[PDB]
Short mmCIF file of C-alpha atoms in Angstrom, two decimals:
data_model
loop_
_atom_site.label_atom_id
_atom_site.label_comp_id
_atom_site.label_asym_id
_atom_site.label_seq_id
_atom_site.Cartn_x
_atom_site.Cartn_y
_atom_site.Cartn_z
CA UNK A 128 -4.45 6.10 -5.15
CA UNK A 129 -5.98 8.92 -2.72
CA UNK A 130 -4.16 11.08 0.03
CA UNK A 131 -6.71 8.92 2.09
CA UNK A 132 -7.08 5.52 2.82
CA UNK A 133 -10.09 3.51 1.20
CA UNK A 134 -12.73 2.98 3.57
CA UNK A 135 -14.11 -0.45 3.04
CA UNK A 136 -17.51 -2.17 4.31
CA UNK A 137 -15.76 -5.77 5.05
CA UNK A 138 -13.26 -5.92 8.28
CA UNK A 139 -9.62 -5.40 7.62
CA UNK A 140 -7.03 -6.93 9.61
CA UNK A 141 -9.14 -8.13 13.12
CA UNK A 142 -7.60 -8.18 16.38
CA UNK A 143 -5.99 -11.87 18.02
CA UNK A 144 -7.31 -12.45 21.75
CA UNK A 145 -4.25 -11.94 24.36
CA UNK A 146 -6.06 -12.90 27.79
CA UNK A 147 -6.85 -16.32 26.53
CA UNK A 148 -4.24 -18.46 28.75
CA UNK A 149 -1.99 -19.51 26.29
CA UNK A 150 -0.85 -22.81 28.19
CA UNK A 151 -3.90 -24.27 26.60
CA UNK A 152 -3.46 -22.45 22.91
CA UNK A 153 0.60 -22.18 22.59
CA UNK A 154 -0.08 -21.22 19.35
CA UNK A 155 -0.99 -17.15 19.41
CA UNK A 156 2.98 -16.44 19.44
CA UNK A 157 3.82 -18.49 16.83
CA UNK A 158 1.31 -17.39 14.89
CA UNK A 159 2.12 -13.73 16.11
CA UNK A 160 5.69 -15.06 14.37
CA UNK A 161 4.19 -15.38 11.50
CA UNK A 162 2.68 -12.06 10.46
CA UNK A 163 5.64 -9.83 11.54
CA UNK A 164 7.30 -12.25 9.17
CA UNK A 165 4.96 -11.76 6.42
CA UNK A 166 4.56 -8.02 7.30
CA UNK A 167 8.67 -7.25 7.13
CA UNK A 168 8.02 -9.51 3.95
CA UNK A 169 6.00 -7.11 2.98
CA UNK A 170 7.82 -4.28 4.14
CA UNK A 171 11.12 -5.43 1.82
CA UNK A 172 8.12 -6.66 -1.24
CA UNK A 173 6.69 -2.69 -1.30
CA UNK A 174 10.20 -1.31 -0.74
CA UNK A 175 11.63 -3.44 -3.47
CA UNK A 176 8.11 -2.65 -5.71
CA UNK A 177 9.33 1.23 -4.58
CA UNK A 178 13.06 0.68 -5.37
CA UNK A 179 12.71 -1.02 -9.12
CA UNK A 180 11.79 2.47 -10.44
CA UNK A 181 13.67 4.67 -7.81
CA UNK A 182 5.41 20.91 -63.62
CA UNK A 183 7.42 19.02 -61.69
CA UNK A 184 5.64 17.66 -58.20
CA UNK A 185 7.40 16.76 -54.67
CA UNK A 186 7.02 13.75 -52.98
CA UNK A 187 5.62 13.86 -49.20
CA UNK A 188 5.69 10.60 -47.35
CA UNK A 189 4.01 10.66 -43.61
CA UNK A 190 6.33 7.70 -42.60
CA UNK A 191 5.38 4.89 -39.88
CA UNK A 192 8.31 6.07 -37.95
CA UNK A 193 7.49 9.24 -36.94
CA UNK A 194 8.27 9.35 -33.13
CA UNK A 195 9.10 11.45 -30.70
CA UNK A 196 12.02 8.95 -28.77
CA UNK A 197 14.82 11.22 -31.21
CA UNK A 198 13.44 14.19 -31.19
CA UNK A 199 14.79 17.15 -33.34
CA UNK A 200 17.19 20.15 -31.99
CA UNK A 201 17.31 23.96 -32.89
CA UNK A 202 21.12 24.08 -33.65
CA UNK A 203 21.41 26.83 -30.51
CA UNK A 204 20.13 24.24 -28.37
CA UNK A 205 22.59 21.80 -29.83
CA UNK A 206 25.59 23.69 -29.57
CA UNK A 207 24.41 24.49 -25.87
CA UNK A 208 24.41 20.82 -25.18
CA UNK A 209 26.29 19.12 -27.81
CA UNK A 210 24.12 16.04 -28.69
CA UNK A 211 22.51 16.00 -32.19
CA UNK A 212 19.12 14.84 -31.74
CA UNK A 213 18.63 13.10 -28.52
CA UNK A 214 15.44 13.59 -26.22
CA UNK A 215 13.61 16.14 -24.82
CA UNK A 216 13.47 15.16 -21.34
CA UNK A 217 17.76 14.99 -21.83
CA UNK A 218 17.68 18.87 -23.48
CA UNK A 219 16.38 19.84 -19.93
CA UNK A 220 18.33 18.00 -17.74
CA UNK A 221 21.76 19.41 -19.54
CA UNK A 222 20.17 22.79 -19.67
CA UNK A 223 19.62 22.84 -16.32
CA UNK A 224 23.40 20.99 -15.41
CA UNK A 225 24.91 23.96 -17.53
CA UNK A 226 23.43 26.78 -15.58
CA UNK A 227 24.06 24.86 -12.10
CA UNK A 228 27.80 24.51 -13.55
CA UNK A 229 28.25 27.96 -14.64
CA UNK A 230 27.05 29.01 -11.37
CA UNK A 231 24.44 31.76 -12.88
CA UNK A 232 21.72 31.61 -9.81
CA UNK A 233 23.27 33.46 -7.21
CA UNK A 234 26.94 33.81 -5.15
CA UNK A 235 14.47 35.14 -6.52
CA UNK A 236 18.18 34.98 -6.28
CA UNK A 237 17.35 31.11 -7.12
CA UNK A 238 15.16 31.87 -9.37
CA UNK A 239 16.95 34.81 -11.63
CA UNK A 240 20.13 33.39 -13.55
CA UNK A 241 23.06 35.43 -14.78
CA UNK A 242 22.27 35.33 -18.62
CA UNK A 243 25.64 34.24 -19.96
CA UNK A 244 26.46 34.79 -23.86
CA UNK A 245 25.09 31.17 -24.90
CA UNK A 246 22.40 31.32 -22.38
CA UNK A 247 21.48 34.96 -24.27
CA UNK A 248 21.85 33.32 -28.06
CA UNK A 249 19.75 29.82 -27.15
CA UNK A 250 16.89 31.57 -25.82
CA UNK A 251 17.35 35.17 -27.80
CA UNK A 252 16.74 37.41 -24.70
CA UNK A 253 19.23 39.86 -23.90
CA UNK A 254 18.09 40.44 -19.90
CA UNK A 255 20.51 40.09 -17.20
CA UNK A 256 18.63 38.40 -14.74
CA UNK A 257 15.74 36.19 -16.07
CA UNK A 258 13.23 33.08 -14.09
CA UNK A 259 13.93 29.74 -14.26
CA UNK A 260 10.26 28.79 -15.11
CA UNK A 261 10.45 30.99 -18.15
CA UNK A 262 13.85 29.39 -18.61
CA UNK A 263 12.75 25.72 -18.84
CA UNK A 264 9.50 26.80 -20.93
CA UNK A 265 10.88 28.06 -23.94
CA UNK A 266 12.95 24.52 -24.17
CA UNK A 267 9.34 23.18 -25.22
CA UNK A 268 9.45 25.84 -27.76
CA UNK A 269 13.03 25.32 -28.90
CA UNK A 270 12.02 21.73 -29.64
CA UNK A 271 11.20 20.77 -32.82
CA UNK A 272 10.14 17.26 -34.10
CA UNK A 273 11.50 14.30 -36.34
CA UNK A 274 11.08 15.16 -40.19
CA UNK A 275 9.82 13.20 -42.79
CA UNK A 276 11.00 12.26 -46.02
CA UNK A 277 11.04 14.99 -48.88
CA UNK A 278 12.18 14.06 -52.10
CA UNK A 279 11.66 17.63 -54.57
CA UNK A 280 12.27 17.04 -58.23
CA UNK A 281 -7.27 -10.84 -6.66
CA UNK A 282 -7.42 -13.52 -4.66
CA UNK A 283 -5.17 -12.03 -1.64
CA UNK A 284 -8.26 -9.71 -1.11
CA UNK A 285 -10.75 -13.03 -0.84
CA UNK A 286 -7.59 -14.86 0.99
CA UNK A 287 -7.28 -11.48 3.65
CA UNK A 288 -11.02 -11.45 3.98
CA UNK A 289 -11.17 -15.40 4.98
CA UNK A 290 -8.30 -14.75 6.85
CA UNK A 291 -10.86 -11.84 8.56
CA UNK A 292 -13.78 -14.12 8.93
CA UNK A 293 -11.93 -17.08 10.32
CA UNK A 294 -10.48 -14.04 12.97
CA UNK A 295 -13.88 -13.08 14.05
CA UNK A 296 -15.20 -16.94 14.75
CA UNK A 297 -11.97 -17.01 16.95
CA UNK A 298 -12.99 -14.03 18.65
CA UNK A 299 -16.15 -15.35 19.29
CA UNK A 300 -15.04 -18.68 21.26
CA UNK A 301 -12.39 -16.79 23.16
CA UNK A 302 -15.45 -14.24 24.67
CA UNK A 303 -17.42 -17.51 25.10
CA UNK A 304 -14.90 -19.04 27.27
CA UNK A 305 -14.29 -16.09 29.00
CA UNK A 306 -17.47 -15.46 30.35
CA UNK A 307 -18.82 -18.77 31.48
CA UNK A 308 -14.63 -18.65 32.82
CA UNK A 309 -15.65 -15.26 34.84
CA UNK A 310 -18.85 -17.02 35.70
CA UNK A 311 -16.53 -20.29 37.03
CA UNK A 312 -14.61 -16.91 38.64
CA UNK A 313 -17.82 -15.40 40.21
CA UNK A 314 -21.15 -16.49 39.47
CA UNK A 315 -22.77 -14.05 41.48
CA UNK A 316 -21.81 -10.65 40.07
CA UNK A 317 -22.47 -11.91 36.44
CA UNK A 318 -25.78 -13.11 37.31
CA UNK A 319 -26.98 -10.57 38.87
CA UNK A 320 -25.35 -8.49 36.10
CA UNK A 321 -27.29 -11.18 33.58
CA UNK A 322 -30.86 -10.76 35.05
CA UNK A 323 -30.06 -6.96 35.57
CA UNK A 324 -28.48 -5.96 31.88
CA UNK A 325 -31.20 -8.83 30.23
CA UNK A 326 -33.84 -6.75 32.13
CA UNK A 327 -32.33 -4.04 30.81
CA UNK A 328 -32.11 -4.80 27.34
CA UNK A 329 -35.79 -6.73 27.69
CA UNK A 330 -36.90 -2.75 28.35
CA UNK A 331 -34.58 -1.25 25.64
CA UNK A 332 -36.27 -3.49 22.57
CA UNK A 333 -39.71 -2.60 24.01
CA UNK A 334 -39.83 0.86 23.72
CA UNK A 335 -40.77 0.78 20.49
CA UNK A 336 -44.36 -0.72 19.78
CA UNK A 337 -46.77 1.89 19.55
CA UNK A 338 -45.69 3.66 16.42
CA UNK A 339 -47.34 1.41 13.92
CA UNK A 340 -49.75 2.19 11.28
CA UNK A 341 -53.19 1.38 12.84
CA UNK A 342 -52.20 1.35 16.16
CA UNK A 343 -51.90 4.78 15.96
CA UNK A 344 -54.90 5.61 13.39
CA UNK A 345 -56.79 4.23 16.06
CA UNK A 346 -57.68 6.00 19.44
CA UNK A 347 -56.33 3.15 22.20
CA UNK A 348 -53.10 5.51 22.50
CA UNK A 349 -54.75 8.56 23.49
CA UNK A 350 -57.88 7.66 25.19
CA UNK A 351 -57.54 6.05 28.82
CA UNK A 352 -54.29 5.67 29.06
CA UNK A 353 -52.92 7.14 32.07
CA UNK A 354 -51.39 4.18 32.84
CA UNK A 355 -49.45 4.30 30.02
CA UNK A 356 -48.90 8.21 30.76
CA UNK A 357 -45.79 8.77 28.23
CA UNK A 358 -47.83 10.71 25.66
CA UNK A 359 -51.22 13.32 26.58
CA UNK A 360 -49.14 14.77 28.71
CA UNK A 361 -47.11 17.02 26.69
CA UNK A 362 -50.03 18.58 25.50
CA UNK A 363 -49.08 20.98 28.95
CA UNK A 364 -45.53 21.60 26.77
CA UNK A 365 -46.17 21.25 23.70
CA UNK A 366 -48.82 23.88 23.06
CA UNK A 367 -47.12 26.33 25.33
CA UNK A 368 -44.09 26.35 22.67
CA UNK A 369 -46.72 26.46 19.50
CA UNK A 370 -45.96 22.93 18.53
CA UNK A 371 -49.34 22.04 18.43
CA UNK B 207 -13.50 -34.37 22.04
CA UNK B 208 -10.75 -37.44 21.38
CA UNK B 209 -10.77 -36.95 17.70
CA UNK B 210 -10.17 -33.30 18.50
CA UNK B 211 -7.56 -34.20 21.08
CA UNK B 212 -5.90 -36.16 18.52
CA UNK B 213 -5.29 -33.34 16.01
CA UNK B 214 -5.23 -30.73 18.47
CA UNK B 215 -1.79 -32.19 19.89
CA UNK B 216 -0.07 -33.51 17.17
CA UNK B 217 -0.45 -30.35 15.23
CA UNK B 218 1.19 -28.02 17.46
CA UNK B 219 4.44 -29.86 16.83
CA UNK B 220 4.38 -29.94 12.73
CA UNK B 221 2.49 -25.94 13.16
CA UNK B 222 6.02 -24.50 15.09
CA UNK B 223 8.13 -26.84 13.30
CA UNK B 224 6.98 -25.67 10.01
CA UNK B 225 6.83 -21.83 11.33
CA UNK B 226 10.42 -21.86 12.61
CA UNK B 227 11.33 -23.99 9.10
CA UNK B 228 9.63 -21.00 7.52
CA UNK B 229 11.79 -18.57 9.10
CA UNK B 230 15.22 -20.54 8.55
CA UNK B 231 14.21 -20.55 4.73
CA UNK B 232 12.85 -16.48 4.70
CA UNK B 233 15.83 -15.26 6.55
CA UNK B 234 18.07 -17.26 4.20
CA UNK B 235 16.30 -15.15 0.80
CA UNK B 236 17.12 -12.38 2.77
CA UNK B 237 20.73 -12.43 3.40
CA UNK B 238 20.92 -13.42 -0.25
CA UNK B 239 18.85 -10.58 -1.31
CA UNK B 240 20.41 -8.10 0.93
CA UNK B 241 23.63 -8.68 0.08
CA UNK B 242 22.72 -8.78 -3.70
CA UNK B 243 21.35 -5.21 -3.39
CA UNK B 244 24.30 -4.08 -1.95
CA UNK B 245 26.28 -4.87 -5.25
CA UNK B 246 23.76 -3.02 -7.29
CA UNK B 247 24.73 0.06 -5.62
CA UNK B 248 28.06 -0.20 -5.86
CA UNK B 249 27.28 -0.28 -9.72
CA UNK B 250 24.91 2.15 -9.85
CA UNK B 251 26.75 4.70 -8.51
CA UNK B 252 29.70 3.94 -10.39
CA UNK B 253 27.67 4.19 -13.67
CA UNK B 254 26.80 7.51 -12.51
CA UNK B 255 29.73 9.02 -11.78
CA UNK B 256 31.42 7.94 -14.68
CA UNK B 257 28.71 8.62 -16.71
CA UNK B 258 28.23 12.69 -14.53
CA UNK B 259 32.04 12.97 -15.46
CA UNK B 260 31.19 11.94 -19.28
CA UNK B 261 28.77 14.98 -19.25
CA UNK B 262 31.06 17.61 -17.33
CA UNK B 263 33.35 16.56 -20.75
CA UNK B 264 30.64 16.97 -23.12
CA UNK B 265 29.88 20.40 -21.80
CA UNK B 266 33.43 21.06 -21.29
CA UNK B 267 34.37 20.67 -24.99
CA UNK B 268 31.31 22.60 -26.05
CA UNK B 269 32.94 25.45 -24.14
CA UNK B 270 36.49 24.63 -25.93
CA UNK B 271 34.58 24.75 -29.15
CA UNK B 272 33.56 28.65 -28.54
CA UNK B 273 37.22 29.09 -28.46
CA UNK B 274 37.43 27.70 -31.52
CA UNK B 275 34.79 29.73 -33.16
CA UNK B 276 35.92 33.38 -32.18
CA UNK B 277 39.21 32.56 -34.45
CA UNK B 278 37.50 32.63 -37.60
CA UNK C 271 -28.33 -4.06 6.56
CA UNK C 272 -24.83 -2.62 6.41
CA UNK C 273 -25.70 -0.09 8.79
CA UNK C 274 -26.85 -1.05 12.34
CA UNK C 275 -29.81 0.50 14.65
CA UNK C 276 -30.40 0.68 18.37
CA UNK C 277 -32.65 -1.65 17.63
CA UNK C 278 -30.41 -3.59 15.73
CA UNK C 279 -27.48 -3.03 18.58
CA UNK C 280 -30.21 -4.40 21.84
CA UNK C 281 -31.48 -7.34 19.61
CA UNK C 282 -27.68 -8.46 18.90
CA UNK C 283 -27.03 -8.05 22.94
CA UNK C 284 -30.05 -9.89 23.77
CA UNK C 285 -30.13 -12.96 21.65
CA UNK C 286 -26.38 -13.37 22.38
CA UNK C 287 -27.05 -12.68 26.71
CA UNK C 288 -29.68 -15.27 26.58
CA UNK C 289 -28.23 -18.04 24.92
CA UNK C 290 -25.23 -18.51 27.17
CA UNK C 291 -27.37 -18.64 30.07
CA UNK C 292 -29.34 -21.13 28.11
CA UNK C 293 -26.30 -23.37 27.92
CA UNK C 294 -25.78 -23.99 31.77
CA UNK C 295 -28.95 -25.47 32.23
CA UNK C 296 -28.18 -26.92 28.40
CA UNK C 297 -31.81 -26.96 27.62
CA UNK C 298 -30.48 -25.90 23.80
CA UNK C 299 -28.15 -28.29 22.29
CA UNK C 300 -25.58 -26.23 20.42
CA UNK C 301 -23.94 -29.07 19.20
CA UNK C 302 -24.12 -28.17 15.10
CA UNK C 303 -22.67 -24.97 16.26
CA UNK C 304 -19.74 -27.00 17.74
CA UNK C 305 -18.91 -29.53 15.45
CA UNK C 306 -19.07 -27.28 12.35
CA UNK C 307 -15.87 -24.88 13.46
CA UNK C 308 -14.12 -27.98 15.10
CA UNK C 309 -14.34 -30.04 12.29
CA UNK C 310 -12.02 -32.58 13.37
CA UNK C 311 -11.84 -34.33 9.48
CA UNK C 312 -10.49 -30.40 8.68
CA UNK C 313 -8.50 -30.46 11.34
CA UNK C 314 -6.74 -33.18 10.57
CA UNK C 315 -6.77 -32.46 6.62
CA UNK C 316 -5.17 -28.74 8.41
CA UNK C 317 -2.68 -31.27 9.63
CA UNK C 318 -2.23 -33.52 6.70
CA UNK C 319 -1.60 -30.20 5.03
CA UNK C 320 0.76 -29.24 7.48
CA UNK C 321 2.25 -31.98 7.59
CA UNK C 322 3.13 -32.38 3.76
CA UNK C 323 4.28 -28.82 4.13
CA UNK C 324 7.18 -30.45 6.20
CA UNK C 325 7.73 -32.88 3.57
CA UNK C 326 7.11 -30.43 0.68
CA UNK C 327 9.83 -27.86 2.10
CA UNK C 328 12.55 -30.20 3.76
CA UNK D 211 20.89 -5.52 -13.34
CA UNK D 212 23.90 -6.39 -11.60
CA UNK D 213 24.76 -7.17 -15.94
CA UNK D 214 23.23 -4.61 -17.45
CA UNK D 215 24.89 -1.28 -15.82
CA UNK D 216 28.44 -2.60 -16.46
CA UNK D 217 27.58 -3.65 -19.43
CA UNK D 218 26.66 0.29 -19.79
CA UNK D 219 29.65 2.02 -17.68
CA UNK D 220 32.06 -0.11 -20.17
CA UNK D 221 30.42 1.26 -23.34
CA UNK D 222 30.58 4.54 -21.78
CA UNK D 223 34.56 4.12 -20.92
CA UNK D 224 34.85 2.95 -24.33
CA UNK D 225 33.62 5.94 -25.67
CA UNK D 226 35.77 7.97 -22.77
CA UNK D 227 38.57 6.13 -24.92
CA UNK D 228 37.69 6.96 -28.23
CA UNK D 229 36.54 10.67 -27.41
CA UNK D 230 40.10 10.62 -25.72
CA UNK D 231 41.37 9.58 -29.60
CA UNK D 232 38.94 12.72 -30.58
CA UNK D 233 41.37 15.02 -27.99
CA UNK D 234 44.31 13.58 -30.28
CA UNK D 235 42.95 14.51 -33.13
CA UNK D 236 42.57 18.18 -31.51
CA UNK D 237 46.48 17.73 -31.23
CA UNK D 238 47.33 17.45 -34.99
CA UNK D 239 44.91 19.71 -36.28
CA UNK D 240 46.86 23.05 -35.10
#
């Protein structure tokens, strides 16, 4: 995944309605039951999904079993550690044990170890203080591999977005009680807000008709219409900035 | 509306018997869960530190080994 | 169509203002718009399915 | 799980034991 959520062009996760009166309903709680059960459900599910994991010729055979899971030592990294061939990932972790039980670090004072005598013959420096990084490098250098044989001589998505849709038709009937309920309330001062805002909007989708192809290739825009007024007007403005 | 009413107030009763029945049987997978995590920690950390002290000898007698290695 | 315009915002408004108001004098029926999200042959097959979700987990 | 790490810290005693035996064998061979 991102360091950002997933922006997505369906709704996720819709609201519930809350002044519906719920003496009619008495079923928004109950249902509000239900998803903080499912969502501490799903808060053990992903921390459980977070917790599982937290002449005479020589004979040269390239064998199937060449793998890296036992994975050869340098005998100075073996005597450092004292497993044979184990695993690389296992060479680091008891290279890094050995220094944090000697104490080398410090009593970058993190950083630069006290090279001990072992420490000195694994790695072959002879420094006194020396970086970790470098320290932990040359341990994918010291390792060598395995050697052959040498023989010489869903639906929860479509379920959540149903789930969505089937929010969103409950949203609707909640408004449309609501409003013919504030209209039972006061039918005055949502009338008068009806046949003001329905004016309103009435003006808002008709102010924008005379940008068409040939009404404007024609000349009934321009020509007589100072009742219309809105354009041949500017013509004042616009040529006195250069717009032309 | 009357075939609405019918299944509009029967339902109520069999939707919060059902949700609290669903929360009796959650809660119980829970506790049983819960508790059975609690043992694997236990377990875990015991293979650990037995397992952390198994090292500390490894290393240990890697050290004892130098001592046996300057006397010849 | 995934986006929306102020046209697309004012025709949305409108059409939805206009047909409430056209309910209290009920000169539209709105009666396929009922039925369809009662369903009350769903709503009882919502119950049937509740209901064997009693018998299913008791 | 609850099998599988004792099944582990067990074999890893076991060996404990017989690395213990390998300490005995440090006491015969001076």
């Amino acid at each position: 995944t991102q360091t950002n959520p997933v922006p997505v062009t369906y709704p996720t996760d819709a609201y519930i309605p809350t002044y519906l009166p719920d003496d009619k309903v008495s079923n928004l709680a109950d249902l509000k039951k239900l998803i903080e059960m499912d969502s501490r459900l799903d808060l053990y599910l992903t921390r459980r999904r977070l917790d599982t994991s937290i002449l005479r010729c020589s004979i040269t055979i390239q064998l199937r079993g060449v793998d890296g899971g036992k994975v050869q030592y340098s005998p100075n990294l073996a005597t450092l550690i004292g497993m044979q061939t184990g695993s690389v990932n296992d060479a680091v972790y008891s290279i890094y044990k050995y220094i944090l039980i000697n104490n080398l670090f410090v009593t970058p004072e993190l950083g630069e170890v006290k090279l001990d005598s072992l420490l000195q013959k694994v790695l072959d420096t002879n420094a006194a203080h020396l970086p970790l990084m470098n320290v932990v490098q040359t341990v994918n250098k010291l390792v060598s591999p395995l050697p052959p044989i040498i023989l010489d001589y869903a639906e929860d998505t479509a379920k959540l977005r149903e789930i969505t849709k089937l929010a969103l038709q409950l949203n609707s009937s909640a408004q449309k009680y609501q409003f013919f309920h504030e209209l039972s309330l006061h039918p005055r001062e949502t009338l008068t807000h009806y046949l003001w805002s329905s004016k309103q909007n009435e003006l808002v989708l008709q102010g924008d008709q005379y940008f068409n192809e040939d009404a404007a290739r024609t000349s009934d825009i321009y020509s007589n219409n100072n009742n219309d007024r809105s354009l041949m007007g500017n013509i004042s403005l616009l040529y006195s900035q250069g717009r032309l | 509306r009357e075939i609405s009413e019918k299944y509009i107030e029967e339902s109520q009763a069999i939707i919060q018997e059902l949700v609290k029945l669903t929360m009796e049987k959650l809660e119980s997978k829970f506790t049983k869960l819960c508790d059975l995590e609690t043992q694997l920690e236990m377990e875990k950390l015991k293979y650990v530190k037995e397992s952390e002290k198994m090292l500390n000898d490894r290393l240990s007698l890697s050290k004892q080994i130098l001592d046996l290695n300057k006397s010849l | 169509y995934n986006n929306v315009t102020l046209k697309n915002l004012t025709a949305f408004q409108l059409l939805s203002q206009r047909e409430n108001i056209c309910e209290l004098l009920n000169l539209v029926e709105s009666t396929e718009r009922h039925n369809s999200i009662i369903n009350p042959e769903r709503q009882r097959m919502s119950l049937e399915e509740m209901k064997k979700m009693l018998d299913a987990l008791k």
